[PDB]
Design a protein around this ligand. Sequence first.
Ligand SMILES: Cc1cc2nc3c(=O)[nH]c(=O)nc-3n(C[C@H](O)[C@H](O)[C@H](O)COP(=O)(O)O)c2cc1C
Ligand code: SF4
Ligand code: SF4
Ligand code: SF4
Ligand code: FES
Ligand code: FES
Ligand SMILES: [Mg+2]
Lengths: 87, 260, 217, 42, 431
Amino acid sequence: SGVNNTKKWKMEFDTRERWENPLMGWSSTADPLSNLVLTFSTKEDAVAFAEKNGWSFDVEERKVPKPKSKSYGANFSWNKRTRVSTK
Amino acid sequence: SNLIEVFVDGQSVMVEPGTTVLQACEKVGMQIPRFCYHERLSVAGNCRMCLVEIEKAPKVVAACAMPVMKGWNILTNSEKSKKAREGVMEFLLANHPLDCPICDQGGECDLQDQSMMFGSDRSRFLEGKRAVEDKNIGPLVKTIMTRCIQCTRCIRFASEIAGVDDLGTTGRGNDMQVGTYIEKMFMSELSGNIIDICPVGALTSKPYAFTARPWETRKTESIDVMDAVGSNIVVSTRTGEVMRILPRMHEDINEEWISD
Amino acid sequence: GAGGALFVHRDTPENNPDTPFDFTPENYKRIEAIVKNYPEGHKAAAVLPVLDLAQRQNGWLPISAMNKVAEILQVPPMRVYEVATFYTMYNRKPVGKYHIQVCTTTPCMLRNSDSILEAIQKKLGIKVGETTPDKLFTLIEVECLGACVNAPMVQINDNYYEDLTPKDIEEIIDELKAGKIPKPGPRSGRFSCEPAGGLTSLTEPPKGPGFGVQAGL
Amino acid sequence: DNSTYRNLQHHEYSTYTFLDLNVELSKFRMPQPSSGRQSPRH
Amino acid sequence: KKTSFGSLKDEDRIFTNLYGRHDWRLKGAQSRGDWYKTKEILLKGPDWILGEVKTSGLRGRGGAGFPTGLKWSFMNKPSDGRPKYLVVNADEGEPGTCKDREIIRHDPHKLVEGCLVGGRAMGARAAYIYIRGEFYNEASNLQVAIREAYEAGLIGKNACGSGYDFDVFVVRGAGAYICGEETALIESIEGKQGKPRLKPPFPADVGVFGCPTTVANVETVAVSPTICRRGGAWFASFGRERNSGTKLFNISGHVNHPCTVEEEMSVPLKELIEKHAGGVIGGWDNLLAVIPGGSSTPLIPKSVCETVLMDFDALVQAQTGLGTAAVIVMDRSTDIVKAIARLIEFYKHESCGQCTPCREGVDWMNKVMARFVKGDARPAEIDSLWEISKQIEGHTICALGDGAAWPVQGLIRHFRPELEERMQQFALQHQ
Ligand SMILES: Cc1cc2nc3c(=O)[nH]c(=O)nc-3n(C[C@H](O)[C@H](O)[C@H](O)COP(=O)(O)O)c2cc1C
Ligand code: SF4
Ligand code: SF4
Ligand code: SF4
Ligand code: FES
Ligand code: FES
Ligand SMILES: [Mg+2]
């Protein structure tokens, strides 16, 4: 339920091929940028960085949970269906 | 409008009447500790972890269930609130089993993280702990009820979101248990979601058991295609192999749940 | 201390959902009255009485009785299970036809309430939680029963016996064994918690109606 | 007068006296109010 | 004006059939002054009754001690289209308390008339009596009394010729001390487990079945009609200021004649023991401790109880509180640690367990006290226990957590040397 990891913007590269090592069965990657991740304060800064370095980018708007009205009184409702069967 | 002025740590903010203390704290930008409160579920008030101090009030109120009124100054980082949180975590961890190395919720446990941030660092519990027998609710949810903290979140989810009244609390006092009281399989199209809401490793994913750790995995945000709803998912992989699928929040399509 | 009773149910040939149980027509009339007591749309409020009525018909509550109550009241069986396992007066296992409950809370324990428990154990030859081999008596230890001022006391099937002594409890047990039902009430020639020789209150005859009505009424 | 005890009736109470009294009082009571639905699950 | 209290005249008591020496049916109640001029009281209005109760100075007899006039006043609002109900608290779960049983099985008509008067004052449509499940004979006695009232056209449609319809219902619990709590009782009546619900919403807004509700003790509603009939000033004459009225005292434990007696409020504890109960067994010098308000209130030693009064304010000053006025005495020949451990075990057995503080902490305190009885702990643990109690009190949902923390706090505060001595002995024998 923690929300402290959804505060900053992240820029990351697309996933490429990984294969099984013929000896010892490890995972091998042929691309250098796979583990790279960058942190930006705002969307504009990340977009500016991507344009400056000449990388094509896909940007997605931040999703924030909508305000929800919660009432303790609703559980013990006289006629509405929000009555709880048990607590 | 009808908005009322409330203070969080001396900072004013407008809140619609009927807003709880916890929601005002989120509006200011702070997350009150919680174990039983879920926004998509009815308010319970069991865990008492959200206890916060209102200025010039001798009693600590539960931020999740207490509506706020004009003029209140919520002292979230006050000494009284910190002591209340420490006491609540001490009581919660008094009977918790030492199962962290073998628990499937090792690096993603709300109990662990909230004990690290808001709890103490040692125990004065010198007695023996309790132990309850495991329940069997099907081949999807692995059940280990010794780790249950009795937050009654799965019960509320089953009763309201899933519309199935199979789960409930049997017993009284310390030995009150969460289960079905009979050998019954909790079967529904939304059965697996109780794994996510359960803050502890009491309910875990049976096919995913003993497979990976949360810090190892890489998260890829993608779209589910098994139905026409198009619910958003997070594919959790590890060394080029899909480990599991998790729901992703989208208030307009699937909220925060996915089908079995 | 420890409870000793399990709060989960495992199927038994004696206790299974196929165990026959149904209400007699008079019990159906009583259930109708009980349901009519509560406002319409809130029949679930009748879970507690009806369930207890089932016990009075059967002596204990099998899983079939719980399912029947849930079916009659149109509530999920899990809620009936919750109610049955929460409250202590609901017997989820068979008991003897006479259920002895001894109060051992501090007001009773102060007035030598252990001697009566030992006397019952010796007379019946059973421990504090077992039942007689012939299935007549069932001893159990319980909390305050609301008669602290008349301690020590014992409850046997909705009957209160107060100011008990080992001789008195053995006499009650053997009268129950004979068949005649002993009269409820305190022993040692006292009734309803008055001082034995004090009588410091309620001596003069009671005053009649309208003794001290204020003016204007 | 006050020497004797006058609460000896409860010595003759059976296991169905409460329910029988309820069922006979059932005809003396006003109709209950309604919530507008059969049950909260309806 | 008056300074000395503790001399209540026999004709001036409220419950004249307390010991059951007279007939408890309708004829006996009418002969003793019950159901007299009730129509005039009903026709006088709810405002007049509420004002009479407020000027009476009556306070809650269940243990909370809140004023009942102010509590009753909350329900006096215009109808919102939802029926209003009155709930009578007859659980009697508190150890040492027996008054409600004796006034429900020997004078039920006063209870019924008080239910009617309270319903009229608060505009309640009907009253629900929640009698304790173990109280079976007295529940049937109350039911028979209710039937008699219905026949005499005293309740029900057009009760007392005032054009007001009031219905009295009796429901039975099943062995739960937590069901005494008002919200837990409302939940139990609604058909769920007896788990207390949080506040707000208060029962005056969202109570039984979601309707406005007011929970009042048996003694409060029982004495309400007598206060209405004889005036509130007469009731306010007894006791001190903010402690007016007469009270039913149960005296039990190590006394020669444990008994229930009705007495003026601010009667000294020593006078109450020596006069009615016959004194402490083995003399007054044999007294060791006394719990004046049932298990919830902390105990006080002999020195504090030598010159202490029985009312809310004086007993709060003694760090105890009056509670339900259930005096339990213990002489010097008992293990007080064992008694307090038994009380903590009772609280452990009688907790609903929905909130973690009460559940876990009370089990923890039960284990610690069981270890203290043998002296198996170390002195540094004693303060630890104190802290545990402070981590329970004020953090729970209902007052059962506070009522389990207070006895431990009182025992520690007044008999720490006894605990230290016992553990020192255990260390000495066990080396
Ligand atoms: C755990 C618990 C148990 C209680 N049991 C009783 C009881 O058995 N009888 C009673 O009159 N009050 C009991 N009370 C006090 C109730 O709060 C009280 O009945 C209610 O608040 C109304 O009290 P009043 O009638 O004095 O205003 C209990 C309180 C708690 C916390
Ligand atoms: S539930 Fe959390 S605290 Fe408990 S054993 Fe599992 S990881 Fe550890
Ligand atoms: S199983 Fe999980 S969700 Fe359910 S009550 Fe226990 S901790 Fe809460
Ligand atoms: S304090 Fe105890 S009895 Fe009261 S609600 Fe919490 S767990 Fe239940
Ligand atoms: S989060 Fe509010 S009491 Fe649990
Ligand atoms: S202490 Fe024995 S009946 Fe309450
Ligand atoms: Mg989990």
